[PDB]
Design a protein around this ligand. Structure first.
Ligand SMILES: CCC(O)(CC)CS[C@@H](C)C1=CC[C@H]2/C(=C/C=C3C[C@@H](O)C(=CCO)[C@H](O)C3)CCC[C@]12C
Lengths: 240, 11
């Protein structure tokens, strides 16, 4: 029931993801070193990690079938609002339920709740973020489903500032229908049970995390002394 | 619009 077009969409998104996500973590050495001891000792490092990841997200989004037909303004709006959400999704790959941390290849680059706290965040964000990573892990998504969910996240019509909401929606709907059909034809039960609805709930969860993250970000970037330790790309995309 | 780096990365 998966058309040639739908199978093409999946192969494109899979390749786009393979070309833009590095599970070897080879670049983490390029980042300002992580500091654990502490007034925001982990902010420079994780700011760099995020800035690096924003660049990966942009590269993925450009390869989403249809994305490039939007106004420059609308591509920008969708990436600005989605970037943190997609990075949270992306990060599930290094998240381990063994100890509820993001484990990126080594000890220096294994991040837990206290590291995220040392980046300026409170439990208001960190607790639901962990709960999110756990719930997402528990879905045990196919990689096919993972990349579709990321693409659907980016092309949402209700994003703030969206101009051509009509065109954004048609782009998304084609992806949504690809995902729904994929699960039916390709995800065997019981894992498939309500899987689509569950995945959309993770996008609602992401909207909520986006909102809290923005609050804590404005509070963090309120003092220029902290704003100083971010990167130019982070300041541009998350605001300042 | 006043996102130089974002726009350049998207081109
Ligand atoms: C420093 C403040 C700031 O709010 C914004 C600059 C981020 S803190 C917090 C909200 C947050 C979001 C993504 C999370 C994480 C992402 C982890 C990644 C590792 C790996 O999976 C990965 C790429 C490997 O190449 C992803 O792109 C990012 C885990 C730790 C905590 C991270 C950084």
């Amino acid at each position: 029931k998966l058309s040639e077009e739908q199978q093409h969409i999946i192969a494109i998104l899979l390749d786009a993801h393979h070309k833009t996500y590095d599970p070897t973590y080879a670049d983490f050495r390029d980042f300002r070193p992580p500091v654990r001891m502490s007034p925001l000792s982990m902010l420079p490092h994780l700011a760099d990690l995020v800035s690096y990841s924003i660049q990966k997200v942009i590269g993925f989004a450009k390869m989403i079938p249809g994305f490039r037909d939007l106004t420059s303004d609308d591509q920008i709006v969708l990436l600005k609002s989605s970037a943190i959400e997609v990075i949270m999704l992306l990060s599930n790959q290094s998240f381990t339920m063994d100890d509820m941390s993001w484990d990126c290849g080594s000890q220096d680059y294994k991040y837990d709740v206290t590291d995220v706290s040392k980046a300026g965040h409170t439990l208001e964000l960190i607790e639901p973020l962990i709960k999110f990573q756990v719930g997402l892990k528990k879905l045990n998504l196919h990689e096919e489903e993972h990349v579709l969910l990321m693409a659907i996240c980016i092309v949402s019509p209700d994003r703030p500032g969206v101009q051509d909401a009509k065109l954004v929606e048609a782009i998304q709907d084609r992806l949504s229908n690809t995902l729904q059909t994929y699960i039916r034809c390709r995800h065997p039960p019981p894992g498939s049970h309500q899987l689509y609805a569950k995945m959309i709930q993770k996008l609602a969860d992401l909207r909520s995390l986006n909102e809290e993250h923005s609050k804590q970000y404005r509070s963090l970037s309120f003092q220029p002394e902290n704003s100083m330790k971010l990167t130019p790309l982070v300041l541009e995309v998350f605001g300042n | 619009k006043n996102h130089p780096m974002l726009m350049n990365l998207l081109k």
